Structure formats: structure tokens, C-alpha cells
């Protein structure tokens, strides 16, 4: 568990069908660095909020996972939840 997981879950829950569509694409739109893994868009559509929270934290790390979440969210042009999510994990 941890604040990263709690806050990512909260964020995903606060996103809508539209935002989750764009997020699920964005998560595999902005090219990821080498080391980590990419959750493909098929996977992301078959997954939901908690399924992502578990995968996106386990498949990376807590800090990197919440960082990714706020990063990709900020790439969506969403800035409110990005900054809040950042502090939700690490105020």
C-alpha cells in the first residue's frame, strides 16, 4: 500500500470516462524511458482504477508511479489533480 497507491486510486476515481479514455491512451502516448515497463493501451482499457493503481505502482515503484500518474495527467493538460496528486503522495 502507501500514499502513492491511495492517491493514484483517488485520482483515477476522480477521473471520468472521457478523462480515463484519454489517460489510458496518454499513458502509452508520451514515450517512456528505458528500464521501466509500458502498460499497453489494450491492457489499460481492460484495466480500471485500482487495477491500474496496483499495476502502475508494482510495475514501477510508489514514488515513480505517482510521479508518472501526475506527469501523464499533466501531459493531458490537467494541472489541478496533477499538483494535488503530487502533494497527496508527498506533501
Swiss-Prot record:
Changing residue 48 to A: Abolishes interaction with PYDC1. Changing residue 45 to A: Abolishes homooligomerization. It comes from the Eukaryota. Changing residue 13 to W: Abolishes interaction with NLRP2. Phosphorylated. Changing residue 52 to A: Abolishes homooligomerization. Changing residue 56 to A: Abolishes homooligomerization. Induction: In macrophages, up-regulated by endocannabinoid anandamide/AEA. Changing residue 21 to A/E/Q: Abolishes homooligomerization. It is found in: Cytoplasm; Inflammasome; Endoplasmic reticulum; Mitochondrion. There is a cross-link at residue 55 (Glycyl lysine isopeptide (Lys-Gly) (interchain with G-Cter in ubiquitin)). Widely expressed at low levels. Detected in peripheral blood leukocytes, lung, small intestine, spleen, thymus, colon and at lower levels in placenta, liver and kidney. Very low expression in skeletal muscle, heart and brain. Expressed in lung epithelial cells (at protein level). Detected in the leukemia cell lines HL-60 and U-937, but not in Jurkat T-cell lymphoma and Daudi Burkitt's lymphoma. Detected in the melanoma cell line WM35, but not in WM793. Not detected in HeLa cervical carcinoma cells and MOLT-4 lymphocytic leukemia cells. Residues 1-91 form the Pyrin domain. In breast tumorigenesis, methylation-mediated silencing may affect genes and proteins that act as positive mediators of cell death. Self-associates; enforced oligomerization induces apoptosis, NF-kappa-B regulation and interleukin-1 beta secretion. Homooligomers can form disk-like particles of approximately 12 nm diameter and approximately 1 nm height. Next to isoform 1, also isoform 2 and isoform 3 may be involved in oligomerization leading to functional regulation. Component of several inflammasomes containing one pattern recognition receptor/sensor, such as NLRP1, NLRP2, NLRP3, NLRP6, NLRC4, AIM2, MEFV or NOD2, and probably NLRC4, NLRP12 or IFI16. The CARD domain mediates interaction with CASP1 and NLRC4. The pyrin domain mediates homotypic interactions with pyrin domains of proteins such as of NLRP3, PYDC1, PYDC2 and AIM2. Functions as a key mediator in apoptosis and inflammation. Promotes caspase-mediated apoptosis involving predominantly caspase-8 and also caspase-9 in a probable cell type-specific manner. Involved in activation of the mitochondrial apoptotic pathway, promotes caspase-8-dependent proteolytic maturation of BID independently of FADD in certain cell types and also mediates mitochondrial translocation of BAX and activates BAX-dependent apoptosis coupled to activation of caspase-9, -2 and -3. This is Apoptosis-associated speck-like protein containing a CARD. The gene is PYCARD. The chain holds residues 1 to 91 of 195 of the full protein.
